[PDB]
Amino acid sequence: DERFYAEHLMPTLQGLLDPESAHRLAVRFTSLGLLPDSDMLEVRVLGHKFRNPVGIAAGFDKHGEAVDGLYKMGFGFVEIGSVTPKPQEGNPRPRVFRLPEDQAVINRYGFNSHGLSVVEHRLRARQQKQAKLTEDGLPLGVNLGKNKTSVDAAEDYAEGVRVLGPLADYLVVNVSSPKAELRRLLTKVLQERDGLRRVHRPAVLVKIAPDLTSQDKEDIASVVKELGIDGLIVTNTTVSRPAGLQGALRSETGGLSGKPLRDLSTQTIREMYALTQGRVPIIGVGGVSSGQDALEKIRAGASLVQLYTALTFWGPPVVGKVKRELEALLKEQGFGGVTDAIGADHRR
Numbered sequence: 599d600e601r602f603y604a605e606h607l608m609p610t611l612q613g614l615l616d617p618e619s620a621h622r623l624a625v626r627f628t629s630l631g632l633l634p635d636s637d638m639l640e641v642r643v644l645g646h647k648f649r650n651p652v653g654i655a656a657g658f659d660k661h662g663e664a665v666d667g668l669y670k671m672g673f674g675f676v677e678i679g680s681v682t683p684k685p686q687e688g689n690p691r692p693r694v695f696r697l698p699e700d701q702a703v704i705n706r707y708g709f710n711s712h713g714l715s716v717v718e719h720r721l722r723a724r725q726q727k728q729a730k731l732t733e734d735g736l737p738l739g740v741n742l743g744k745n746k747t748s749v750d751a752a753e754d755y756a757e758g759v760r761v762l763g764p765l766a767d768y769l770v771v772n773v774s775s776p777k778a779e780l781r782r783l784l785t786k787v788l789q790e791r792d793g794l795r796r797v798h799r800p801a802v803l804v805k806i807a808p809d810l811t812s813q814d815k816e817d818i819a820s821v822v823k824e825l826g827i828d829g830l831i832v833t834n835t836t837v838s839r840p841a842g843l844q845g846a847l848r849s850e851t852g853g854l855s856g857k858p859l860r861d862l863s864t865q866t867i868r869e870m871y872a873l874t875q876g877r878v879p880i881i882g883v884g885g886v887s888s889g890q891d892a893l894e895k896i897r898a899g900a901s902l903v904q905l906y907t908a909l910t911f912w913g914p915p916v917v918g919k920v921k922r923e924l925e926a927l928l929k930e931q932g933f934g935g936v937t938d939a940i941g942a943d944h945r946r
């Protein structure tokens with residue numbers, strides 16, 4: 599199955615369809631269930647149980663259309679979004695580009711979004727089914743964005759907390775799509791979160807870019823610890839273009855994802871974990887396509903990982919591949935389970 603998808607099915611789909619069409623078709627098949635975990639992999643973090651540490655990253659299911667199909671694919675948690683307060687169309691097409699020679703993607707969707715109300719009703723339609731999933735170790739995250747024309751960014755995020763916070767196990771404030779300002783924004787987000795009833799009160803995480811200065815990262819770490827933010831997601835796509843990219847489309851505007859981002863992300867995880875003294879959970883994301891990629895991020899300080907771009911090259915079988923390879927490496931390196939490996943590089 600893994601070799602069939604990787605060598606025949608996916609490159610044939612890649613040859614027939616532009617990338618955005620292929621993505622919409624993938625969302626449709628996934629939402630319909632048309633698709634091909636040991637105790638070692640279980641993680642307790644963010645007030646929840648995660649049956650395995652491999653999640654689908656924000657951007658694949660922007661509108662909350664495919665959540666149950668994504669669990670069926672084998673992900674330990676699903677993050678939907680980003681969702682903006684009002685519906686908006688995003689940038690003109692084409693707005694996403696494959697770099698097959700680099701195992702990379704560049705995108706400038708621009709927060710195309712069905713908007714909070716539509717996503718609210720979509721998640722309400724399965725709210726009790728989610729409550730059982732979460733209880734069974736399959737939590738749901740909701741990533742919040744802001745409309746293009748908004749004047750008050752904090753009020754857009756506050757709206758998302760009030761509308762989708764009650765349906766989420768965790769919320770993501772994505773201030774990273776391609777110090778006192780951040781403190782102001784996050785104080786307002788956390789106040790809105792704390793005003794939700796306890797059974798409907800999610801964890802709040804901040805998702806950051808890999809393109810931050812050292813000053814930026816220091817200031818983020820300080821605010822996150824000061825305010826009691828529950829976690830970090832590290833990282834979004836990069837607006838850098840590392841030397842060595844071969845794809846003809848490498849100079850398209852947008853955020854770069856996939857293998858060229860991987861170690862830039864891992865190093866950002868490493869720094870943020872050290873700057874927060876290992877006390878702030880990190881979801882690590884960027885260029886994960888194997889168990890080794892996942893364990894490097896875990897050893898660098900991630901309690902959980904996500905992927906997206908690998909799914910677009912290798913198809914659904916990549917999820918089970920990453921999990922199988924991660925379990926094998928954990929045993930080889932003598933860890934009793936994922937939990938013991940979190941942050942392990944910092945104890946050498």
Ligand SMILES: Cc1cc2nc3c(=O)[nH]c(=O)nc-3n(C[C@H](O)[C@H](O)[C@H](O)COP(=O)(O)O)c2cc1C
Nearest residue numbers: 655656657679680833834855856884885905906907
């Ligand atoms: C097509 C595409 C769309 C994305 N949209 C978003 C988004 O709406 N919100 C967000 O926080 N990140 C989004 N991302 C970033 C991913 O969540 C992730 O941080 C990044 O792609 C690195 O992971 P990867 O290398 O495994 O793809 C998007 C990524 C891609 C490739």
Ligand SMILES: Cc1c(C(=O)Nc2c(F)c(F)c(-c3ccccc3)c(F)c2F)c(O)nn1C
Nearest residue numbers: 611617620621624627628633694909910913914
């Ligand atoms: C976002 C994206 C995809 C994408 O998502 N492709 C894709 C996928 F991510 C899938 F997961 C499947 C799939 C295959 C079988 C069953 C269910 C889903 C698929 F066909 C796909 F094209 C792609 O090829 N390019 N870009 C930018």
Ligand SMILES: O=C(O)c1cc(=O)[nH]c(=O)[nH]1
Nearest residue numbers: 706707708709775835853
């Ligand atoms: O354009 C988008 O919607 C988008 C792209 C991306 O790479 N990251 C993000 O947060 N939003």
Ligand SMILES: [Cl-]
Nearest residue numbers: 687689690691
């Ligand atoms: Cl459009």
Ligand SMILES: [Cl-]
Nearest residue numbers: 617694695696
């Ligand atoms: Cl393309």
Ligand SMILES: [Cl-]
Nearest residue numbers: 725764765798
């Ligand atoms: Cl509710």
